[PDB]
Amino acid sequence: TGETLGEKWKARLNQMSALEFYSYKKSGITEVCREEARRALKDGVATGGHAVSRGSAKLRWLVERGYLQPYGKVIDLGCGRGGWSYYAATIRKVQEVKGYTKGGPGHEEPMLVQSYGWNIVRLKSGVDVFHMAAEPCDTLLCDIGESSSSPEVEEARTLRVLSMVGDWLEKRPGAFCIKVLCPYTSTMMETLERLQRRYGGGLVRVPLSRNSTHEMYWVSGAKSNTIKSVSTTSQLLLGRMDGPRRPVKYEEDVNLGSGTRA
Ligand SMILES: Nc1nc2c(ncn2[C@@H]2O[C@H](COP(=O)(O)OP(=O)(O)OP(=O)(O)O)[C@@H](O)[C@H]2O)c(=O)[nH]1
Ligand SMILES: Nc1ncnc2c1ncn2[C@@H]1O[C@H](CSCC[C@H](N)C(=O)O)[C@@H](O)[C@H]1O
């Protein structure tokens, strides 16, 4: 014993055969159709309203449910191509969005499309956020966390993220959404519950997430129990390994429109 359910799921995950993992990573998950979005971005239709990545539909799913209500100044730590930034520009109460990513050889460089509100969005690449000082903001976004086959490695990097956002949350942002890659260890649930008492909010699982990751999102509009919501998600991914394979629930990708904003 000694293992959490999430630590049990990870061990079983690492022991699946090639196809067993292949047919499981998207068994029963929701997924937006990205075929026509890439073809228009590959060609260059910047005013078609196409999302730059799958991150737009994931963040949209959270906002269309009030899991957070962005407004005012928005900071997007780890913007990559800008899926979260280009969607936040379409929110009415949002007035300004600033993005920061690393980019480089093995990372995503920001894309410049013109969906609705593109003129208020800036994406500065080559920025290490862990060495960047925190600014006062209205809403804070963070989608940083690379996957590892080791739960202890995912633990360490997830903790590095939550310490970094500690000074950003200290700038009293009104709303926030922070990616929690590994929330299933004993220390994480201890850590997250400590940050919750202090900064509020709650942990949420997104159906668009693959079953190959235990990531959950720490949003400001939720008030779910720390240990209960994780264990519910740990049991979900475990139950999806045992039974028969399930189809993917496809849905239409988000369209962000076009045009400028004053
Ligand atoms: N048994 C098995 N487990 C894997 C494999 N690849 C990843 N896992 C696990 O998947 C976790 C995260 O996978 P990701 O690479 O981030 O995303 P993905 O679901 O694998 O998507 P793909 O890269 O297309 O396979 C890793 O931490 C590994 O623990 C594999 O090939 N076989
Ligand atoms: N220490 C760091 N500082 C700044 N950016 C980092 C970073 N570590 C990783 N990143 C970047 O953060 C990004 C997170 S993936 C972001 C995807 C985005 N939310 C979308 O919807 O498109 C990656 O592209 C990675 O290159």
How does this model look, in words?
By secondary structure, the protein is an alpha/beta fold. The protein has one domain: 3-Layer(aba) Sandwich (Rossmann fold). It contains 8 helices and 9 strands. The protein has helices at 5-14, 18-24, 35-43, 55-63, 83-88, 151-170, 186-199, 226-242; strands spanning 30-32, 72-77, 94-100, 121-124, 139-142, 175-180, 202-204, 216-219, 249-251. The strands form 2 sheets. Strands 4-3-2-5-6-8-7 form a 7-stranded mixed beta sheet. Strand 2 (72-77), helix 5 (83-88) and strand 3 form a beta-alpha-beta unit. The radius of gyration is 18 Å and the shape is globular. The termini are far apart. The structure holds guanosine-5'-triphosphate (GTP) and S-adenosyl-L-homocysteine. S-adenosyl-L-homocysteine binds next to helix 5. The record marks 143 as: Essential for 2'-O-methyltransferase and N-7 methyltransferase activity. Residues 1-262 form the mRNA cap 0-1 NS5-type MT domain. This is RNA-directed RNA polymerase NS5. S-adenosyl-L-methionine binds at residues 53, 83-84, 101-102, 107-108, 128-129, 143-144, 217.
Whole-Å distance between the termini? Answer: 58 Å
Main sheet strand line-up = 4-3-2-5-6-8-7
CA-based gyration radius? 18 Å
Beta strands, count: 9
Strand content: 15-25%
Which structural class best describes the helix and strand composition?
A: alpha/beta
* CATH topology assignment: Rossmann fold
Number of helices: 8
Q: How many domains in all? A: 1
Membrane topology: Peripheral membrane protein
Protein name: RNA-directed RNA polymerase NS5
Subcellular location: Host endoplasmic reticulum membrane; Host nucleus
Organism: Zika virus (isolate ZIKV/Human/Cambodia/FSS13025/2010)
